[PDB]
Design a protein around this ligand. Structure first.
Ligand code: MHA
Length: 207
């Protein structure tokens, strides 16, 4: 499946694509403003994620750091990124269907549209001014708005035991982006697409 990753932000993003224990395609690439990168994700892949990293500093070998979304200090991500990161999440060809969503469970850094190329299912967007409205305790100095699990590290927010529910901090994200997951046990906003669809992820969407 192809994922066309498009940077319409004024700033460079270092796109990242991983399934947690391995890169998807090349795993990462620098996208200056206006640049695109089309990756191939193998059919049947589960637990894939795409995200933006902002303000990165890499040496020629591809090692360094990013202000948001860093993945073990690598340009070409093998693992997932450090919050805060708006997440495009997908599992493909799971019993005949693809499953896509956007998540704020690991916070928000860059506004995102995640859309199929087909009429057969809808897209998702989280593009509200979350960083400008971010509660003080969730502000990330590197840019972005942390989730409460990252900040407070308790089950109330991290949903590690029992049955967590919404909190003031999940509701902050949820009102701004109703179609994105705001905490681990949020009512799912996953979209079911026909199996083997293709997709476009746009950073800083407009129309
Ligand atoms: N249209 C946009 O998304 C503009 N961007 C700002 C920019 O690209 O300079 C907002 C953001 O990055 O949160």
């Amino acid at each position: 499946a192809t994922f066309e990753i498009v940077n319409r932000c004024s700033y460079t993003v270092w796109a990242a694509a991983s399934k947690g224990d391995a890169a998807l395609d090349a795993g990462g690439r620098q996208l200056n403003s206006g640049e695109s990168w089309t990756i191939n994700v193998e059919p049947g892949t589960n637990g894939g994620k795409i995200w933006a990293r902002t303000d990165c500093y890499f040496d020629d070998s591809g090692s360094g750091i990013c202000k948001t979304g860093d993945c073990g200090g690598l340009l070409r991500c093998k693992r997932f990124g450090r919050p805060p990161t708006t997440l495009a999440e997908f599992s493909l060809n799971q019993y005949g269907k693809d499953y896509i969503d956007i998540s704020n469970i690991k916070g928000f850094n860059v506004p995102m549209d995640f859309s199929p190329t087909t009429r057969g299912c809808r897209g998702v967007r989280c593009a509200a001014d979350i960083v400008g409205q971010c509660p003080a305790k969730l502000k990330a100095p590197g840019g972005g708005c942390n989730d409460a699990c990252t900040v407070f590290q308790t089950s109330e927010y991290c949903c590690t035991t029992g049955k967590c529910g919404p909190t003031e901090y999940s509701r902050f994200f949820k009102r701004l982006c109703p179609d994105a997951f705001s905490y681990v046990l949020d009512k799912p906003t996953t979209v079911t697409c026909p199996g083997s669809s293709n997709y476009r992820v746009t950073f800083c969407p407009t129309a």
